[PDB]
Design a protein around this ligand. Structure first.
Ligand SMILES: [Zn+2]
Lengths: 512, 302
């Protein structure tokens, strides 16, 4: 119920992923690849081996990990699932979010899609499975008439995976309950309970007519199920650790698997002993998406915990020797910020990233100050130490891989400093007392007309592109905009509805 | 056989005479009595006195005192006029370990003390972090907060905690709040598994004061900790000794031991100086109510 203000220190365009990639979708009509980043950004890439810069666009709106994505309606519509508990509906051609569904109450982990019904389903750690008519979701404007809801029950524990068949007659969920639960999505009737796995099931696939199922599990096995017999008809133990990602060819005869053991295999379902090691990746495999240009698929795209996305070619159909040693295409990634130190001035931050690079940042001005290269991180902290005390007034989080700064009413205003010791200069040159959190709040909302008294805070600005996020403590994001956009009529209306009274006190009423 | 009561020293008689029937204890303290050439000398002084009086009775019957141990213990730690058998067992085993470490057979650590694992497993990356503790006995509850089983009771100790909801475990590897399983596991085992039953209680605003629980657990004879082991082993343990208390307090009461020889396959119920014998069938059917209920259970690697 308690509202926090946060903002992200970043460039206007983050062309490359700043974290691992959770999910992948390939548009065959436009040769476009969608990546679902742990950095909360969805990006569209061109897969033409022509272009040197495959980047097309980033689609920004999520606040936390985007766990699954589904391209619908011949690439017209994208649906996304995030750890911020929301499902979002995107226009995939122009790349902006049109609606946000908020029926989930925990991390949304998996999406499922029935192409022949334009039906999608969502499932997450809250043990809920919601069914959504895609055409009903896109039909929203002014008075939407809302959407009537439908959910599936029976899941006794947190859900980690979910699949539907193409016809939309079978839905299966995978979870930490170690059983796969199956329903008919048309009737919400329970069909069967499939027992056999001894651990979480993070990967599920169904054949076109929903008669067979492949499951991949953290127990290291792949299992094939007959839904007509309600039993397991084959078990495959080709990995050393948990299996996290599965693909299957159009003929449902070769299964592609990947997971914690970094190895990616192609196994023939009819003859298990014939299996091919496609490659060994550099990080745990999270998801794979076959390229289906041609019947025997030419390549497989692979998402890992690293920020790079590799396409591996299959032009050449037990094994020690990997089929491939270098990726066929490479989408470059960026570094994640993995370590953060607040300096004694409670104003600057030292970071270390995945490249072991060290940087110096200005929290007050929301920007980087200098890159320090590969210096020793702890020696750099002690080198800039100053024996001064300033009360804590913000918090930083690295969940997206970028610097996100959060302000809370409890300590946002705790740090008074003098203009001179803060590196500022004022018009009267008096050097009175400045409250860091109060000045920052005014810079973040500098473009909000309601705060304009003839405007800003009078000492510094933040970059206009800084994202400003208003969320509830523990979960629910309320409203996210860019700093420069506050003057809009939609943004100003939504701000009046979302800005908590403890911010209004300082930024509008000018109390302090 | 037969330990002279010294005036509310049944706590010491019961624990010592269970120690006397421990697989490695006899040979161990003799090994340490020859290493030295002063608790280990007092231990051997009693064992020799016990073994010699058994031989005197063995030849021609007619109609031993642990006083040697008590005077040494009182100089070692002057807690002593009636105490808990569990506290005195620690002081004995602890000091034998303290001397063993100062001399350098690793007696106490090998056959009383085991290794404990505090395992947390992030469900998003499946990266296992563990914390190591040592333990010489399993503190086990009888009742919850009817006749519960011992598997239930050990499950209460070696619990698994699923971390889901508003409080999630922050994984440093994932750099993000995640679901996690946090479990308790046994790694390295001792030759004798001690089970310490928390069979005592207290109430509020009447009577009195403390209270004992007169409804013991369902004690099995076979015991395997494969279900809680770090890596499933086929080691099986067998019940061989049980210390029992009669009374409604922890400070004072009658302590009695019931040890099995491993008369092969029987029950040698002995109290203070008053020694008896019982059968297998009419002893396990005797614990459920009733002058006393069990307090300590000792299983050994069979
Ligand atoms: Zn983790």
């Amino acid at each position: 119920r308690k509202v926090q203000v946060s903002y992200v220190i970043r460039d206007e365009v983050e062309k490359y992923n700043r974290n691992g990639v959770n999910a992948l979708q390939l548009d065959p009509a436009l040769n476009r690849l969608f990546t679902a980043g742990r950095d909360s950004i969805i990006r569209i890439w061109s897969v033409n081996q022509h272009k040197q810069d495959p980047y097309i666009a980033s689609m920004e709106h999520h606040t936390d990990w985007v766990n699954d994505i589904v391209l619908c309606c011949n690439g017209k519509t994208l649906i996304s699932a995030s750890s911020d508990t929301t499902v979002k509906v995107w226009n995939a051609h122009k790349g902006f979010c049109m609606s946000t569904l908020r029926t989930h109450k925990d991390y949304v982990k998996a999406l499922a899609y029935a192409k022949d019904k334009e039906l999608v389903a969502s499932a997450g750690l809250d043990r809920q499975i919601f069914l959504w008519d895609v055409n009903t979701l896109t039909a929203l404007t002014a008075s939407n008439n809302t959407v009537t809801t439908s959910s599936l029950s029976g899941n006794k524990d947190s859900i980690y995976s979910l699949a539907m068949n193409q016809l939309g007659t079978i839905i299966v969920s995978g979870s930490t309950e170690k059983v796969l639960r199956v329903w008919d999505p048309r009737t919400c009737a329970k069909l069967m309970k499939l027992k056999g796995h001894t651990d979480n099931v993070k990967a599920l696939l169904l054949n076109r007519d929903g008669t067979q199922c492949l499951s991949g599990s953290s127990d290291g096995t792949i299992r094939l199920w007959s839904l007509g017999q309600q039993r397991c008809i084959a078990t495959y133990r080709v990995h050393d650790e948990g299996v996290w990602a599965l693909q299957v060819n159009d003929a449902f005869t070769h299964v592609y698997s990947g997971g914690r053991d970094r190895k990616i295999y192609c196994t023939d379902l009819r003859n298990p002993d014939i299996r091919v090691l496609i490659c060994e990746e550099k990080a745990p495999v999270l998801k794979m998406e076959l390229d289906r240009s041609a019947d025997p698929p030419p390549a497989i795209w692979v998402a890992t915990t690293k920020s790079t996305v590799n396409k591996w070619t299959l032009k050449g159909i037990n094994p020690i020797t990997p089929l491939c040693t270098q990726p066929d295409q490479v989408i470059k990634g960026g570094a994640s910020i993995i370590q953060c130190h607040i300096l004694n001035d409670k104003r600057h931050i030292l970071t270390k990233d995945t490249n072991n690079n060290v940087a110096y940042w200005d929290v007050l001005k929301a920007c980087k100050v200098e890159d320090l290269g590969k210096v020793d991180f702890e020696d750099e902290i002690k080198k800039r130490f100053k024996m001064v005390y300033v009360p804590n007034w913000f918090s930083v989080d690295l969940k997206t891989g970028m610097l996100t700064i959060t302000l809370d009413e409890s300590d946002c205003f705790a740090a008074w400093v003098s203009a001179k010791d803060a590196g500022f200069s004022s018009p009267d040159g008096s050097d009175p007392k400045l409250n860091l959190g109060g000045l920052l709040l005014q810079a973040l909302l500098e473009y909000w007309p309601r705060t304009h008294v003839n405007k800003g805070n009078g000492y510094f600005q933040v970059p206009p592109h800084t994202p400003v996020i208003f969320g509830e403590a523990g979960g629910r994001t309320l409203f996210r905009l860019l700093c420069r956009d506050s003057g809009g009529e939609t943004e100003s209306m939504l701000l009046n509805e979302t800005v908590p009274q403890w911010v209004i006190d300082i930024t509008v009423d000018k109390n302090m | 056989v037969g330990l002279n009561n010294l005036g509310n020293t049944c706590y010491l008689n019961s624990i010592l005479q269970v120690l006397y029937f421990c697989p490695g204890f006899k040979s161990g303290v003799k090994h340490l009595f020859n290493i030295i050439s002063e608790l280990i000398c007092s231990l051997q002084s009693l064992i020799i006195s016990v073994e010699q009086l058994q031989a005197s009775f063995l030849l021609n019957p007619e109609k031993t005192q642990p006083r040697r141990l008590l005077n040494t213990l009182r100089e070692l730690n002057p807690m002593y006029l009636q105490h808990d058998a569990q506290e005195v067992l620690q002081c004995i085993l602890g000091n034998i370990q303290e001397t063993c470490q100062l001399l350098k057979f690793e007696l106490v650590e090998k056959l009383f003390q085991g290794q404990l694992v505090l395992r947390t497993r992030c469900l998003e990356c499946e990266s296992l972090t563990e914390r190591r503790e040592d333990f010489q006995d399993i503190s086990v509850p009888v009742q919850e907060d009817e006749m519960k089983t011992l598997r239930w009771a050990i499950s209460q100790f070696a619990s698994v905690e699923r971390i889901v909801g508003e409080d999630k475990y922050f994984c440093e590897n994932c750099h993000h709040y995640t679901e996690a399983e946090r479990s308790l596991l046994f790694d390295k085992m001792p030759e004798v598994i001690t089970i310490h039953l928390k069979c005592f209680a207290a109430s509020g605003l009447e009577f009195g004061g403390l209270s004992k629980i007169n409804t013991p657990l369902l004690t099995p004879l076979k015991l395997s900790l494969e279900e809680w082991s770090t890596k499933p082993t086929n080691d099986s343990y067998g019940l061989f000794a049980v210390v029992m208390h009669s009374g409604i307090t922890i400070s004072s009461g009658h302590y009695t031991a019931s040890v099995k020889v491993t008369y092969e396959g029987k029950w040698l119920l002995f109290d203070d100086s008053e020694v008896k014998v019982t059968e297998e069938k009419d002893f396990l059917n005797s614990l459920s109510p009733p002058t006393s209920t069990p307090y300590l259970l000792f299983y050994k690697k069979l």
